[PDB]
């Protein structure tokens, strides 16, 4: 059909001619590679589709128009906005109660698209009262009463209500949605678990208050389990959620450790996927940023050698994260812990990254070495450590930095040269 033929049909007072045109429009919007969304908007059809959502009598045209509008709302912000301006949100929310499951579904989907656009339309969908009727659909006794296609859409739309910052989702909305997300995180469908993990990913990406909310529900254990799933779509978000939680307080970080996250991290730190390695090493760095007893659990779960090898073998983005992990460790750790780091052969692969062209990272490594030297001083083993650094070719790279553009680099490298180059309570 032409867009003209669709308009002529929709404008007909004949209810069957309207359905036929809306079918034709649903096809243009779904089957086409380059859909004529802008043509349909300009033809002034959005308001008519939106009122077809209200046609209880003819549930076919409720469904067909819900599809059409889904796909229009799936475009650019201009196109989504066009649908919202056409009054679509409260009409979709009304359809959530539809006794026809597949129409409810399409409304769940449509609302998901709108909420996905950003913080504005997210907050708006909530304002129109989308939460109560959405959670009500997952309020059944047994989750497996719902078809898996219908359930994935609900979980996805729910994740979009948890998404974005500036501002974050309203607290009242998060408090209400979380109990359902806990229940969803124990479902055995991979796609649902990925969607749920994404939701919790977004909720933990904020200040400690928001993290506290997630932690109190008791989901950290179950996330740690999902950390070691086969399905990479589950691991990626689950790891990001865990990473976000350890950005919080020492007590919040401990929940993660207490939940046995450190057992799974060897496979994360050596994952086939670059992205998982980075994120794992980033997560590690935030734990080596913590209390000395937390550093000791990193040591106890045998992870230090894994960080040492990530620092050697990984791509640069990941190596940067290892630099941070190692330096945080040297900053917070006891002399005993630093000795152990040296024994795992940190010195060389760390100092190798001094030839990196990243002024920030260079300063972080020189700090690490400064910290290690202070541990050495307390043992009276600055000579031994000097000689180990010379043997790792690290002295050549420190005095190489005395011809660097940066002044912090120049003076930090100088102070090391001047100062130091002129049981586990020894570096042997």
């Amino acid at each position: 059909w032409s867009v003209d033929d669709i308009v002529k049909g929709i404008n007909s007072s004949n209810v069957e001619n309207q359905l036929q045109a809306t079918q034709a429009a649903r096809k243009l919007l779904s089957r086409e590679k380059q859909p004529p969304i802008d043509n349909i908007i300009r033809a002034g059809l959005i308001p008519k589709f939106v009122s077809f959502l209200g046609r209880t009598d003819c549930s076919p045209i409720q469904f067909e128009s819900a599809w059409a509008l889904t796909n229009i709302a799936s475009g650019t912000s201009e196109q989504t906005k066009a649908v919202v301006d056409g009054g679509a949100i409260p009409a979709f929310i009304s359809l959530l109660a539809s006794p026809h499951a597949h129409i409810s579904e399409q409304a769940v989907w449509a609302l998901g698209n709108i909420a996905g656009d950003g913080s504005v339309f997210r907050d708006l969908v909530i304002k129109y009262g989308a939460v109560d009727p959405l959670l009500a659909l997952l309020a059944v006794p047994d989750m497996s009463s719902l078809a898996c296609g219908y359930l994935r859409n609900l979980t996805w739309t729910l994740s979009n209500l948890c998404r974005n910052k500036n501002p974050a989702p309203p607290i009242d909305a998060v408090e209400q949605i979380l109990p359902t997300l806990v229940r969803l995180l124990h479902h055995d469908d991979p796609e649902v678990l990925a969607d749920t993990c994404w939701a919790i990913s977004y909720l933990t990406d904020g200040p400690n208050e928001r993290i506290g909310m997630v932690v109190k529900t008791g989901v950290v254990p179950q996330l740690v389990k999902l950390l070691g799933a086969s399905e990479l779509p589950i691991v990626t978000p689950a790891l990001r959620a865990i990473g976000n939680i350890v950005t919080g307080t020492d007590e919040q970080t401990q929940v993660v450790i207490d939940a046995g996250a450190l057992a799974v991290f060897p496979s994360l730190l050596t994952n086939p996927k670059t992205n998982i390695q980075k994120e794992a090493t980033w997560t590690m760095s935030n734990i080596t940023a913590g209390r000395q007893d937390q550093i000791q659990q990193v040591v106890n779960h045998g992870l230090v050698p894994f960080l040492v090898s990530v620092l050697s073998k990984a791509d640069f983005k990941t190596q940067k994260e290892a630099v941070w992990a190692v330096t945080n460790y040297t900053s917070g750790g006891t002399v005993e812990q630093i000795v152990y780091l040296v024994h795992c052969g940190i010195i060389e692969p760390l100092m190798n990254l001094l030839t990196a062209k990243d002024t920030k990272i260079i300063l972080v490594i020189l700090d690490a070495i400064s910290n290690i030297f202070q541990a050495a001083e307390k043992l009276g083993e600055t000579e031994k450590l000097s000689i180990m650094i010379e043997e790792c070719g690290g002295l050549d790279k420190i005095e190489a930095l005395q011809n660097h553009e940066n002044e912090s680099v120049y003076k930090a490298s100088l102070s090391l040269i001047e100062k130091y180059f002129s049981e586990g309570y020894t570096f042997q």
Partner: peptide, 20 residues
């Protein structure tokens, strides 16, 4: 040397989906 927040995410879930 304290806690550091995340970069941007490389592999993002869909914002919007069309039904095809």
């Amino acid at each position: 040397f304290g806690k550091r927040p995340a970069e941007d995410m490389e592999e993002e879930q869909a914002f919007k989906r069309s039904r095809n």
